[PDB]
C-alpha cells in the first residue's frame, strides 16, 4: 500500500474505496482492488 | 537432571574401529554423596547439596564437621549444589555415581579456567597490533585511542581494556559423552574442558540440544 498525507484522491479512485479509522490512523480500504489502499500516518515515534 | 562434581585428569585419545581418532578429556567422578536436601518448605527451593572426595581431618573446621555429621557422610574436598526437577528426589547420605550419565548423549562441563594473570589487550581482547616499524614510537601493543573527544569526555563503562585474564568460571556446552565407567570412576567427553589438571569440574547434562 501507499502512504499519503491526503486521501481526497485515493478515496475516490474506485467505487469500493471506503476510508476507516483503524487504531488511530486513517486507512483507505478497498478489498476488491487492493492496489488502491492507503494510510494517512505512520506509527508512533 | 542433577549433575556431578569431578576432577579433571587430563586428555587422551580414543581410536575407533574404523579409523577416527576421538580426542577425549578424562573426568574423574567419585561417588558424589548427598549432605543436605533442600525443599520448598524449609528453603524455598528444591536442590541437593553434595560433596565428593576426602579431606584431612586436621583440615576440617568444626562447623564443617557438624554439617557433614548431620548427614552422616564423610568430609569432602568441598560442597556443591544442584537444582531438582520436581519429582526428582534424593535422601541425605545417598550416593550418586557417574552412571547417571550412562544414557545422556552430551553434557555441559564447567570449570575454573587456567589463569593468565594481568594480560594485555592484544592477548586478552584480540586487539590488533600497531606498526612494528614505520616509525612507531613505543606503541606496538598498546590499545590505541580509548575514547572520542570533548563529547562525552569520558570512557564508556565496559571498555575492553587490559587486566586479569583467566582463573574464572567457564562453561563449555554440548560435548559428546564418549564413555562412562563407574568401576573405574571415569567419564570421557570429547574435546577440551576448562581448567588445569587437578581441578574440580561440574558436569551437568547439557541444557541444550
Amino acid at each position: 500500500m501507499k502512504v499519503l498525507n491526503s486521501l481526497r484522491t485515493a478515496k475516490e479512485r474506485h467505487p469500493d474505496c471506503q476510508i476507516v479509522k483503524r487504531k488511530g490512523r486513517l486507512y483507505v480500504i478497498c478489498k476488491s482492488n487492493p492496489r488502491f489502499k492507503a494510510v494517512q500516518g505512520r506509527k508512533k515515534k | 537432571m542433577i549433575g556431578l562434581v569431578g576432577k579433571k585428569v587430563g586428555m587422551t585419545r580414543i581410536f575407533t574401529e574404523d579409523g577416527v581418532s576421538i580426542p577425549v578429556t578424562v573426568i574423574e567422578v567419585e561417588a558424589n554423596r548427598v549432605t543436605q536436601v533442600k525443599d520448598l518448605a524449609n528453603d524455598g527451593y528444591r536442590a541437593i547439596q553434595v560433596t565428593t572426595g576426602a579431606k584431612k581431618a586436621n583440615r576440617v573446621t568444626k562447623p564443617e564437621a557438624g554439617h557433614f555429621a548431620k548427614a552422616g557422610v564423610e568430609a569432602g574436598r568441598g560442597l556443591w549444589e544442584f537444582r531438582l526437577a520436581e519429582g526428582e528426589e534424593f535422601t541425605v547420605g545417598q550416593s550418586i555415581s557417574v552412571e547417571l550419565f550412562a544414557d545422556v548423549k552430551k553434557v555441559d562441563v564447567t570449570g575454573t579456567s587456567k589463569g593468565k594473570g594481568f594480560a594485555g589487550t592484544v592477548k586478552r581482547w584480540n586487539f590488533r597490533t600497531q606498526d612494528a616499524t614505520h616509525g612507531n614510537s613505543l606503541s606496538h601493543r598498546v590499545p590505541g585511542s580509548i575514547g572520542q573527544n570533548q563529547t562525552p569526555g569520558k570512557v564508556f563503562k565496559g571498555k575492553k581494556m587490559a587486566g586479569q585474564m583467566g582463573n574464572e568460571r567457564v562453561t563449555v556446552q554440548s560435548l559428546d559423552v564418549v564413555r562412562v565407567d563407574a568401576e573405574r570412576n571415569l567419564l570421557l567427553v570429547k574435546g577440551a574442558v576448562p581448567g588445569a589438571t587437578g581441578s574440580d569440574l561440574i558436569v551437568k547434562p547439557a541444557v541444550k540440544a
Binding site: - | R13, G19, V20, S21
Partner: protein, 123 residues
C-alpha cells in the same frame, strides 16, 4: 595454506606454469585456501601455445599444499610445494586434460572427479 599473492605451480596441461592467487573464494574476509578450495588466479608464466596466456584471469582449485591435509585419525599429508588445476571461470571445470603429480582423496568432490581419475597417484 594459500592467500593473495601466493604463487602456485600447476598440476595440468593447461599451458600455465606459474599462477598467482588474487582472491580466496568462499566467504567475506576469507583468509586461506586449501586443498579442494577454489581460488582466483592470474597467470604469470605460460608456454608458447597452450590453452591459456600470460595475464589471463581465472579460477583454479588447489590440489597440493605445503601445509598439507589432516586425516581423521591425526595423520598428515604434506607436499614439497603448492599446486593447483586451472578451471574455466564459469563452468569451474578443468581446462586441461591431463593431471600431474599426486592428488588427494579430499578431491572426491563430484566436480573434481575428473581430476582423481586423471591423477597418477591418489593419497
Amino acid at each position: 595454506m594459500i592467500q593473495e599473492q601466493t604463487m602456485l605451480n600447476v598440476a595440468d596441461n593447461s599451458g600455465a606454469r606459474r599462477v598467482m592467487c588474487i582472491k580466496v573464494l568462499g566467504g567475506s574476509h576469507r583468509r586461506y585456501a586449501g586443498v579442494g578450495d577454489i581460488i582466483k588466479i592470474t597467470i604469470k608464466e605460460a608456454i608458447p601455445r597452450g590453452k591459456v596466456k600470460k595475464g589471463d584471469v581465472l579460477k583454479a582449485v588447489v590440489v597440493r599444499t605445503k601445509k598439507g591435509v589432516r586425516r581423521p585419525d591425526g595423520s598428515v599429508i604434506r607436499f614439497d610445494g603448492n599446486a593447483c588445476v586451472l578451471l574455466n571461470n564459469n563452468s569451474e571445470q578443468p581446462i586441461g586434460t591431463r593431471i600431474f603429480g599426486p592428488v588427494t582423496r579430499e578431491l572426491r568432490s563430484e566436480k573434481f572427479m575428473k581430476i582423481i581419475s586423471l591423477a597418477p597417484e591418489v593419497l
